Amino acid sequence: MPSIKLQSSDGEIFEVDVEIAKQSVTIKTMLEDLGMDDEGDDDPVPLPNVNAAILKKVIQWCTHHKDDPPPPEDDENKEKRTDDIPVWDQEFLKVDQGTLFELILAANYLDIKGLLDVTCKTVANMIKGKTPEEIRKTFNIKNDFTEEEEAQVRKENQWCEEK
């Protein structure tokens, strides 16, 4: 199996498995256009969007999501529609905002709405899971029956800190 060749904005080229990069939507067009996919260390095309600092996190997100643990025998699906986030994703929602912020934007121009949604859910989680504007707080964000709230329809909160 070959791999994807892409060069970050500052000139730091990255090579990694093409199956993971398949999650990146704007990469498939790039792959057919100037990718060719021959050996994987192919001619590097510069991407003026992200540098190697952020890109590694974005493409490693794709790393696990193509490799998510296959269903054993009884329950044949992975998820219905966003129900159980893997330990891979989990760590990216407890990190510094410097990386967390770009995780949304980096995903935007790559069209990985999967990545974008998970981090967006978490950023908006701290308020009320509503509109993700911090300026919303002027009118109290958006009423969402926070009077109840205790139902906690999520669980899986072991509170295992560190990484």
Swiss-Prot record:
Segments for region (Disordered): 63-83
Pathway membership: Protein modification; protein ubiquitination
PTM entry text: Undergoes autophagy-mediated degradation in the liver in a time-dependent manner.
Molecular functions (GO terms): beta-catenin binding; cullin family protein binding; F-box domain binding; molecular function activator activity; protein domain specific binding; ubiquitin ligase complex scaffold activity; ubiquitin-like ligase-substrate adaptor activity
Gene3D superfamilies: Potassium Channel Kv1.1, Chain A
Keywords per UniProt: Host-virus interaction, Isopeptide bond, Phosphoprotein, Ubl conjugation, Ubl conjugation pathway
UniProt keyword Cell wall biogenesis/degradation present: no
Chain residue ranges for the region called Interaction with the F-box domain of F-box proteins: 104-163
Matches recorded under SMART domains: Skp1
GO-annotated cellular components: centrosome; Cul7-RING ubiquitin ligase complex; cytoplasm; cytosol; nucleoplasm; nucleus; PcG protein complex; SCF ubiquitin ligase complex
A GO BP entry: chromatin remodeling
InterPro entries in alphabetical order: SKP1, SKP1-like, SKP1-like_dim_sf, SKP1/BTB/POZ_sf, Skp1_comp_dimer, Skp1_comp_POZ
Protein purpose: Essential component of the SCF (SKP1-CUL1-F-box protein) ubiquitin ligase complex, which mediates the ubiquitination of proteins involved in cell cycle progression, signal transduction and transcription. In the SCF complex, serves as an adapter that links the F-box protein to CUL1. The functional specificity of the SCF complex depends on the F-box protein as substrate recognition component. SCF(BTRC) and SCF(FBXW11) direct ubiquitination of CTNNB1 and participate in Wnt signaling. SCF(FBXW11) directs ubiquitination of phosphorylated NFKBIA.
Family of the protein in this entry: Belongs to the SKP1 family.
Descriptive protein name: S-phase kinase-associated protein 1
Lineage, broadest ranks: Eukaryota, Metazoa, Chordata, Craniata, Vertebrata
